[PDB]
Paper text:
The present X-ray crystallographic and virologic study demonstrates how SARS-CoV-2's main protease (Mpro) inhibitor resistant variants emerge when SARS-CoV-2 is propagated in VeroE6TMPRSS2 cells under inhibitors’ selection pressure. The X-ray crystallography data with mass spectrometry data obtained in the present study clearly show that all three Mpro inhibitors specifically bind to the enzymatic active site of the enzyme through the formation of covalent, polar, (and halogen) binding interactions, causing the dimerization of two enzyme protomers. Each inhibitor blocks the entry of the premature viral polyproteins into the active site cavity, thus presumably blocking the enzymatic processing and maturation of the viral polyproteins. In conclusion, the present data show that the structural changes in the target enzyme (e.g., Mpro in the current work), which certain amino acid substitutions bring about, compromise the enzyme’s integrity (e.g., protomer dimerization and the following structural changes), loosen the binding of potential therapeutics to the enzyme and cause resistance.
The kcat/Km ratios of two newly generated recombinant enzymes, MproWT and MproA191T, were largely comparable (286.55 and 115.04, respectively), suggesting that the A191T substitution does not significantly alter the Mpro enzymatic activity. When MproA191T was examined in association with nirmatrelvir (7.5 and 15 µM) and TKB245 (7.5 and 15 µM) in further native mass spectrometric analysis, dimerization of MproA191T protomers clearly occurred, and the dimerization profile of those protomers was virtually the same as seen with the dimerization of MproWT protomers, suggesting that the A191T substitution exerts no significant effects to the dimerization process. Indeed, the region around Ala191 does not participate in the dimerization process, as the dimer interface is situated more distantly, primarily within the helical domain. The less-binding profile of 5h to MproA191T is in line with the structural features showing that A191T substitution disrupts the interactions between the distal ring of the indole moiety of 5h and Ala191, pushing 5h molecule away from MproA191T, resulting in less anti-viral potency of 5h with MproA191T. Such disruption does not occur as nirmatrelvir.
Author numbering:
A (entry chain A), B (entry chain A): 1 to 306
The structure:
């Protein structure tokens, strides 16, 4: 019944976006209750950003130095603090469209939806994955910072990402909502390299399950294997180790398609050795690693929100 | 700065979704002002759907036979009519979250965002294209019908699709919001075939422009060509004819990258002849045809909504 890179619906989060201006720098903010969270480099000028001293810049700021606009309405700031690489502006108005929400810090391999924004206005929404090198393959221009990444569980928005910077290779980096970066990056304009990226094995298998459910079954073989042996052949192709926790997490997909997890591992071994020989799987000639087990289940069983 | 299959933010449309039940059939509705639009096969039973007589079924229905739920709130129906394959239920309450909206009928080649819903609740959002054979490569399960496709221009939602049925090959079919199908399909459970699908040439070129902007330039050659000659080589590969209107529509991307449209056509000719020889473009080993000129411009210049 089809299989696509699907994102969460964005309305709950659109109701939280605002514009934060400080001097001439403008970027995005998240308004939740009476607090606005945004990247702390909003207090910089251009020339500060090469090697900035944030605490020093913040001393010279008052409440009134921050311009916070929700649509046309201006939000008076009544306090400011800095928490790691994020900035919290207390405001005089609680956001009446605040959803149930929590702040989470995802693990490498987990996915989320990004609502890319400019000037506090939503431009578009797409689904990303936290790569094992702690980067994301997103799409962002100048002024995108403060755009956020999230998951929805029924009614609760789990905010897990806030965008800060783009790295030499076209990939992106940021923080959780407490302002700690993911990976070894810092918020300054200096040379930073990513680290080598490894392929998320459990997400590939999840995608192969997605393919069977959808009738694409040519890659299934009749063989099995052991976790140990599988992991030796994967290592060579820069695939992450598959833990037993991964196997257990794949149990629901295993149960529903009646294909033991270690059979699917066998099928993947073959694909890593022999290549596809010019065939596709779900429309793709490359093995895809940006869908979690949970993503496959929600899409191929039709889970909804609110 | 990255390039992804990006969808419009969905909040404006989420505020319009409702659940329509009639007998035991439940599917999705669109509530705009005081009218709910949904697929007319909500009035069927299972066994009716093999060869249904819709006008006959609707005679036997009253207002009170339709259960319309917006969240927990029930909407009293105060009238019903049928317009082609869509059904309009007048209700006693106008939807206070109705956006500025219009109903449009897109052309093959145009893209839009689908908000897949079940039981009047949003499950996820993704971007599709109206294929030249008048199908879409979507992702839908039972109960998805009435989910809608749309574009946003600043503040106005242009609704262009409503989902009705899935075709033997995993692809999907539906109507505009006046209830006319796209392509030769009808709303009955009988064998229907798609027609052969052709590749949308102008969208491919747009994607190649997207690639240059993003620094991927290996496929550019030094040669030019004529529209005429180009179109002869494309025909063989089941690529649509490139009209002069297409060339003009590509003028903004041409202007910004300083690459005449007919140079890019030359570069595409080579790719259709020689293949990629194992290289990628924007991460893909296949030429991609699901981004319009307009989509590339909005994403790679950062257009926002509201
Ligand atoms: C936030 N609004 C922008 C978003 C950027 C702009 C281009 N694409 C994006 O994702 N973030 C920044 O401009 C951050 C910000 C200063 C510099 N910066 C960068 O993203 C730069 N990157 C780096 O210096 C590097 F190489 F370390 F990654 C830039 C050269 C502009 C891509 C600060 C405070 C780090
Ligand atoms: C609306 N809620 C569903 C959505 C379907 C279910 C599976 N994926 C979808 O997109 N639509 C239907 O069930 C429509 C509906 C009766 C039958 N139908 C179909 O989609 C069927 N297709 C066809 O009969 C065919 F081959 F012509 F395309 C089905 C076999 C269930 C896929 C009506 C009124 C056409």
């Amino acid at each position: 019944s089809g299989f696509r890179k699907m994102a969460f619906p964005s309305g709950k989060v659109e109701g939280c976006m605002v514009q934060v201006t400080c001097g001439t720098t403008t970027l995005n903010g998240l308004w939740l209750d009476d607090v606005v969270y945004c990247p702390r480099h909003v207090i910089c000028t251009s020339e500060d950003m090469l090697n900035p001293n944030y605490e020093d810049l913040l001393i010279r700021k008052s409440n009134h130095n921050f311009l916070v606009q929700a649509g046309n309405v201006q939000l008076r700031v009544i306090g400011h603090s800095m928490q790691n690489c994020v900035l919290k502006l207390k405001v005089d108005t609680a956001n009446p469209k605040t959803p149930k929400y929590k702040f989470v810090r995802i693990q490498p391999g987990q996915t989320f939806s990004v609502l890319a924004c400019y000037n506090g206005s939503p431009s578009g929404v797409y689904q990303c994955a936290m790569r094992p090198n702690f980067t994301i393959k997103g799409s962002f221009l100048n002024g995108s910072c403060g755009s956020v990444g999230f998951n929805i569980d029924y009614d609760c928005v789990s905010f897990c990402y806030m965008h800060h910077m783009e790295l030499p290779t076209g990939v992106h980096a940021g923080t959780d909502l407490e302002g700690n970066f993911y990976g070894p990056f810092v918020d300054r304009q200096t040379t930073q390299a990513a680290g080598t990226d490894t392929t998320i094995t459990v997400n590939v298998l999840a995608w192969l399950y997605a393919a069977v459910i959808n009738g694409d079954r040519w890659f299934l073989n009749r063989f099995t294997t052991t976790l140990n042996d599988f992991n030796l052949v994967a290592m060579k192709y820069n695939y992450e180790p598959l833990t037993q926790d991964h196997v257990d997490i794949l149990g629901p997909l295993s149960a529903q398609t009646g294909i033991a997890v270690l059979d699917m591992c066998a099928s993947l071994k073959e694909l890593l050795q022999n290549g596809m020989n010019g065939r596709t799987i779900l429309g793709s000639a490359l093995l895809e690693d940006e869908f979690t087990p949970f993503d496959v289940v929600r899409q191929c069983s039709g889970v909804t929100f609110q």
